[PDB]
């Protein structure tokens, strides 16, 4: 990371603002179309198209990323509690975090094309790359 990258991440995520929960659910849905191996159902979760849990999960992904951006100077500590989550360890395959974070860039750049320059794109790519490795550090 760097001062330029950190500044790009705040500006990009700042312009997202209240629509972060919507893109979090959208990025999760985009992952299944682009990567069909990722799409797998499990008993205690609702993965329908207009699901309440998928929308609820989008807010949880948004609030986690919002916390990560708020404490971007020490990201590992901010996401240490989330990295021990049992739901992820049991249900989610380690690779899918890199695939979801990739699809979030595709979602964010789609909804915010003007502010998303190649410099900002690479800044969020590096930022979202580190968040994937932090959450998959435990397994």
């Amino acid at each position: 990371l760097s001062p330029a990258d950190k500044t790009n991440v705040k500006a990009a995520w700042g312009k997202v603002g209240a629509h972060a929960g919507e893109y979090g659910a959208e990025a999760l849905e985009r992952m299944f179309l682009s990567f069909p191996t990722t799409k797998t159902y499990f008993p205690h979760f609702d993965l329908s198209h207009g699901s309440a849990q998928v929308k609820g999960h989008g807010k949880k992904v948004a609030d986690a990323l919002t916390n990560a951006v708020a404490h971007v100077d020490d990201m590992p500590n901010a996401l240490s509690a989330l990295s021990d989550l049992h739901a992820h360890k049991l249900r989610v395959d380690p690779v899918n975090f890199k695939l979801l974070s990739h699809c979030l860039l595709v979602t964010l750049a789609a909804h915010l094309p003007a502010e998303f320059t190649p410099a900002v794109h690479a800044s969020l790519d590096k930022f979202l790359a580190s968040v994937s490795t932090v959450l998959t550090s435990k397994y």
């Binding site: 990371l1 760097s2 001062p3 330029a4 950190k6 500044t7 790009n8 705040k10 500006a11 995520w13 700042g14 312009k15 603002g17 951006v69 708020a70 971007v72 100077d73």
Partner: protein, 144 residues
């Protein structure tokens, strides 16, 4: 050169490499960073540390504002009832932390204060933030 004019160049001064800024009696006060339409000023919310330390003196309380990614921050003017306050650098944590600590005096019973500021990454596009309201959890009061 000044803290108000350009934080980019204000932190170039090596005298404030890791200078002390934690001496004397202080107070923890939370705040909220809003914008023109009373919405959350997100970039500032991420940038400024909440709560802020309010250090006491013999005349007026000095509010310390910890601003991260100081290498990209340029303009940072603070006003009290549309009156510009004397902002200055008291310390600065260098890269990779890049936190800039600035202080400014505030009169008794003060809570709301606007911030006219901007940011710039090296020689690039300057992003202006013409209005950002800062509201503390309580009105600031200096001890005797």
């Amino acid at each position: 050169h000044m803290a108000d004019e350009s934080l980019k160049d204000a932190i170039k001064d090596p005298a404030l490499e890791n200078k002390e800024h934690d001496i004397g009696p202080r107070e923890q006060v939370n705040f909220q960073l809003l914008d023109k339409n009373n919405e959350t000023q997100y970039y500032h919310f991420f940038s400024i540390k909440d709560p802020a330390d309010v250090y006491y003196t013999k005349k007026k309380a000095e509010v310390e504002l910890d601003i991260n990614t100081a290498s990209t921050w340029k303009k940072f003017e603070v006003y009290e009832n549309n009156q510009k306050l004397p902002v200055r650098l008291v310390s600065y944590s260098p890269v990779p932390e890049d936190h800039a600590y600035i202080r400014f005096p505030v009169s008794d019973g003060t809570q709301e204060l606007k911030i006219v500021s901007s940011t710039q990454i090296d020689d690039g596009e300057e992003t202006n933030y013409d209005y950002t309201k800062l509201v503390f959890a309580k009105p600031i009061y200096n001890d005797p």
